[PDB]
Design a protein around this ligand. Structure first.
Ligand code: JAE
Ligand code: JAE
Lengths: 212, 214
């Protein structure tokens, strides 16, 4: 089984991924995704989750006292705490494979300038913590990144959900003046494999020369 | 002022676009986001959108006919057609800036093995097409990538290095103190400390950004 807890000030953001879980996987106890409103752990009548940054500058920083309480309740010694942030280590397919065998992921979704660093520092003294970035761009908060991480990980858990791949084709054989490459209809499967390899090579050269 | 159309066989999955800043972006009327069910452009009663690949292989490829009809209706020659795929050019902050001044983005969300290549080829004869990857991982489809792209672009619409650690009150918490320089009120020293933290975090987490091996 894998349990995923997501903590966010926008719990509705995560509701469609919850529903996208096949019933057969839930009934089999293979997966459970739970979403938690961070404001459940606020201390004041205004339900404050952020405050101005020490050292000045623009934006707001999320409060350590609120996050500390939330993680204290939700995390255990076995938890892998995932913190999506544009300042993180890169989240890659290798990461997704590694995390796919975890028993318990907690994903802490921050907003804007981030979560007070002492939250991660404190958590790391009693569980594993991973701050990660899903790409070289900035979003307004961690929620969309959490969706990407949840999907990339869970599709690698049985029954739950190099070079670039080249182009794919299906019927009809001719469409708006363009024919499917005849080699694909040749029945020469060694040649097809070689053709696909060359298409992959060319596409990787053009789009992702970093991979070579 | 921007229009974003998303085409998908799971329109329900795009409802998170109504949350947070993208929700606020539409609430203020700076952007209009519309989500379209691809099955709307099917003509059989099974509403089939995919078929086995030519040349063999696992999985299913989305049919060009259904996609062609959808894009015929939704796109114009001014449209930027965006196709999220793990095989795309990288989507980066620079891309987000570039697309932030577009009048019309159409995001085509494929499933699994993807969309027949002729859809992009055909569209490219009348509009600009960009196949892009949001990162080096594989999803089951383009929907979550669409949400990422929309959020990254919308926050830039009018209207390098890694950021280091941030702190806020209280100055001591569970016996952990905010770095003293941040409490010192010395802007020059704080600027210098933050610059150093940024470069230090970048070397550790993203050495590629500074031209070092990963
Ligand atoms: N706090 C925060 C801000 C931006 C962002 N972008 C991707 S994850 C994340 C998290
Ligand atoms: N068709 C497809 C499959 C996977 C995927 N991952 C990110 S975008 C995308 C699109």
């Amino acid at each position: 089984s894998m349990k995923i807890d997501v903590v966010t000030i926008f719990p509705e953001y995560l509701q469609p991924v919850r529903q996208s879980l096949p019933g057969k996987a839930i009934d089999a106890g293979l997966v459970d995704v739970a979403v938690h409103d961070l404001r459940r752990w606020t201390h004041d009548v205004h339900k404050s989750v952020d405050d101005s940054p020490y050292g000045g500058g623009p934006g707001m920083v999320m409060k350590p006292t609120v996050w500390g309480d939330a993680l204290d309740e939700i995390c255990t010694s076995e938890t892998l705490l995932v913190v999506p942030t544009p300042a993180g280590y890169p989240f890659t397919q290798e990461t997704a494979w590694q995390w796919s065998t975890e028993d318990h992921l907690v994903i802490a979704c921050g907003r804007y300038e981030g979560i007070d660093q002492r939250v991660a520092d404190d958590a790391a003294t009693r569980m594993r913590v991973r701050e990660v970035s899903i790409g070289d761009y900035v979003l307004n908060g961690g929620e969309a990144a959490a969706l990407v991480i949840i999907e990339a990980v869970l599709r690698l858990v049985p029954g739950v959900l190099s070079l670039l791949e080249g182009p794919s084709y299906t019927r009809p054989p001719s469409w708006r003046g363009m024919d499917v490459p005849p080699v694909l209809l040749s029945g020469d499967h060694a040649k097809i494999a070689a053709w696909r390899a060359e298409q992959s090579r060319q596409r990787t050269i053009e789009r992702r020369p970093d991979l070579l």
